[PDB]
Homo-oligomer: 123 residues x 4
């Protein structure tokens, strides 16, 4: 549902995710990370299932943040893949992949994987 | 390098990725998978890091595809995270996460992980 | 530390992990999963850093369970990679990969990824 | 097929994996990586699923290597999860997780993920 996803969310590290879900399945917003070589806000773009199932299934969605803005350029990008589960305590549970740009030689260790849980605060 | 991300790419499964990379870091285009609960094209959106480093590093990027279009709704979304490397033979090396929308009971097994390599051949 | 890892542990799904850490960095035991095409106990084998660092760093370790025993054969195997963090509330935080045996054609979707947190109960 | 997992395998990075597959599902041997904070051989232990299915499916298996030996202690461990496919050209296709022991502050970035393909060539 777009309304349910739209809002301000935070995760366990203390990062901020501000998103708007558009009618066509699009997600746009900004992300502020509490950790890493990151400062200020970054632009994020993603997609979500605008037509989930009836039932108590989560809504699959994903988004990307390239870690470059006017203040910093970390030469990396993160993609979060997960599902939104609404209710009185709406959560977005995800797993993410953080890839850094590297030389052909260190490419084997260019990607980090983790998981984040976001709790909604505002629309 | 970077702008050269624009084009038509294909991966080892035969899927087609058509992207336009905008000067400021955006990625837009369509994706058509050769496998899965999918038919036709799906819209994709992503970001790439528009000012890569001397050093001969690749350009980090990622994009998402929600597997819903006017033909099918597979109730899942895939994100690809990787890097672009240009040169005579340019490729985009990625690892992806495909999450399906499940009930809680099946949440533990909602995500598949894989890797795709794209070239313009 | 072997003593700290040795014991009975459970995770958020309600699965049981019984392990013994040997002096040489080896881990042996049994695993009982609360979910999946799994029944009874399965044998597990792994390795851990028998010489972690001083400091408050976790001990890296990993183990594998092939999901076949005398009662069931799910044609799959899971590997858990994570770190043991001791203290009064010792935990083992992990990320896992569950690969199923498939045809060359469905190989693209042979692996599931997730994360489990284990809480210790007994030695 | 299965028993044929025993042997010396090499991956695209040039690492060498020497394994012995026991009749009841065990995997034992040594690993020597061509990259990283590693030198010489490390002990590995794993499991494979000893009764694979007609159907022409691969044999699921996984193994672990703690990067500590009498030369180095990199305070990390890697697990490879994948499947073995035999035939004229046999390979083991895997995805791995490399976890380092961090302080809590760095726990979020303690795990790398990759994929390796091994052959006996
Ligand atoms: O909120 C954050 N989650 C983690 N993933 C990532 O890429 N950077 C970290 N910050
Ligand atoms: O091209 C594809 N890559 C794989 N990942 C995914 O999500 N579907 C498959 N198609
Ligand atoms: O305890 C469990 N964790 C999950 N990972 C896995 O492979 N099966 C599930 N059971
Ligand atoms: O052969 C190797 N594979 C890669 N994964 C890993 O842990 N170290 C590297 N060496």
């Amino acid at each position: 549902a777009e309304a349910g996803i739209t809002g301000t969310w935070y995760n366990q590290l203390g990062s901020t995710f501000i998103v708007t879900a558009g009618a066509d399945g699009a997600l746009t917003g900004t992300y502020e990370s509490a950790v890493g070589n990151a400062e200020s806000r970054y632009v994020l773009t993603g997609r979500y299932d605008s037509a989930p199932a009836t039932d108590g299934s989560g809504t699959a969605l994903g988004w990307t943040v390239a870690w470059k803005n006017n203040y910093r350029n970390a030469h990396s990008a993160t993609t979060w893949s997960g599902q939104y589960v609404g209710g009185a305590e709406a959560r977005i549970n995800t797993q993410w992949l953080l890839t850094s740009g590297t030389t052909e030689a260190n490419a084997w260790k260019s990607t980090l994987v983790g998981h984040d849980t976001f709790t909604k605060v505002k629309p």
